[PDB]
Design a protein around this motif. Sequence first.
Motif, PDB file in Angstrom:
ATOM      1  N   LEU A  75      56.845  46.254   6.151  1.00 41.86           N
ATOM      2  CA  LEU A  75      56.374  46.419   4.682  1.00 41.86           C
ATOM      3  C   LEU A  75      56.897  47.880   4.822  1.00 41.86           C
ATOM      4  N   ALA A  76      57.274  48.083   5.503  1.00 43.10           N
ATOM      5  CA  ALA A  76      56.884  49.928   5.946  1.00 43.10           C
ATOM      6  C   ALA A  76      58.744  50.327   5.193  1.00 43.10           C
ATOM      7  N   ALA A  77      59.862  49.012   6.017  1.00 40.13           N
ATOM      8  CA  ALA A  77      61.153  49.698   5.121  1.00 40.13           C
ATOM      9  C   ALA A  77      61.107  49.920   4.042  1.00 40.13           C
ATOM     10  N   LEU A  78      60.889  49.299   2.977  1.00 36.70           N
ATOM     11  CA  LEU A  78      60.464  49.053   1.855  1.00 36.70           C
ATOM     12  C   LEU A  78      61.128  50.744   1.006  1.00 36.70           C
ATOM     13  N   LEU A  79      59.953  51.103   1.436  1.00 39.76           N
ATOM     14  CA  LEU A  79      59.155  52.544   0.487  1.00 39.76           C
ATOM     15  C   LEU A  79      60.232  54.321   0.427  1.00 39.76           C
TER      16      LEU A  79
ATOM     17  N   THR B 201      51.016  42.181  -2.831  1.00 37.54           N
ATOM     18  CA  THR B 201      50.106  43.118  -3.118  1.00 37.54           C
ATOM     19  C   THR B 201      50.341  43.968  -4.638  1.00 37.54           C
ATOM     20  N   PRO B 202      49.785  44.360  -5.403  1.00 42.74           N
ATOM     21  CA  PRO B 202      50.483  44.557  -6.646  1.00 42.74           C
ATOM     22  C   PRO B 202      49.249  45.891  -5.972  1.00 42.74           C
TER      23      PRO B 202
ATOM     24  N   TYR C  97      47.687  59.190   5.935  1.00 37.45           N
ATOM     25  CA  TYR C  97      47.397  58.889   4.973  1.00 37.45           C
ATOM     26  C   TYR C  97      48.006  57.845   4.451  1.00 37.45           C
ATOM     27  N   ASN C  98      47.371  57.158   3.171  1.00 35.27           N
ATOM     28  CA  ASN C  98      48.709  55.873   2.232  1.00 35.27           C
ATOM     29  C   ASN C  98      49.450  56.529   2.292  1.00 35.27           C
ATOM     30  N   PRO C  99      50.661  55.287   1.596  1.00 36.00           N
ATOM     31  CA  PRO C  99      51.980  55.777   0.557  1.00 36.00           C
ATOM     32  C   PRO C  99      51.196  56.078  -0.353  1.00 36.00           C
ATOM     33  N   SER C 100      51.938  56.896  -0.864  1.00 34.29           N
ATOM     34  CA  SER C 100      51.829  57.894  -2.513  1.00 34.29           C
ATOM     35  C   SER C 100      51.953  56.597  -3.334  1.00 34.29           C
TER      36      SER C 100
ATOM     37  N   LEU D  37      53.685  51.471  -4.557  1.00 29.30           N
ATOM     38  CA  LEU D  37      54.226  50.106  -5.452  1.00 29.30           C
ATOM     39  C   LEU D  37      55.672  49.666  -5.199  1.00 29.30           C
ATOM     40  N   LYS D  38      56.108  50.613  -4.332  1.00 27.19           N
ATOM     41  CA  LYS D  38      57.744  50.159  -4.023  1.00 27.19           C
ATOM     42  C   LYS D  38      57.798  49.167  -2.725  1.00 27.19           C
TER      43      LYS D  38
END
Length: 66
Positions: A20-24, A55-56, A39-42, A47-48
Motif C-alpha cells: 500500500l505504502a507506495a501509492l500514497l 478498502t475504501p 499516525y495513519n495517513p491523512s 484515500l489514495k
Amino acid sequence: MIINNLKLIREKKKISQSELAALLEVSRQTINGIEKNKYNPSLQLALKIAYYLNTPLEDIFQWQPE
C-alpha cells in the motif's frame, strides 16, 4: 480490536505496508515508520492508498473515531 486503525483493517486483507505504502505519494518508509507509532495517513491521503487498498476511505473512516 474494533477496526481502530489502517493496519487493523489491512491485516485482515493481508496487504502489507510495502504494498500500500507506495501509492500514497509520500516516502514509503516514512509512512511505514510513522504508522509505526506516529499516525495513519491523512484521510485524503488514505484515500489514495485506500483506493488501491481494497478498502475504501470510508472503510477506514468508520463512524467509530476510536
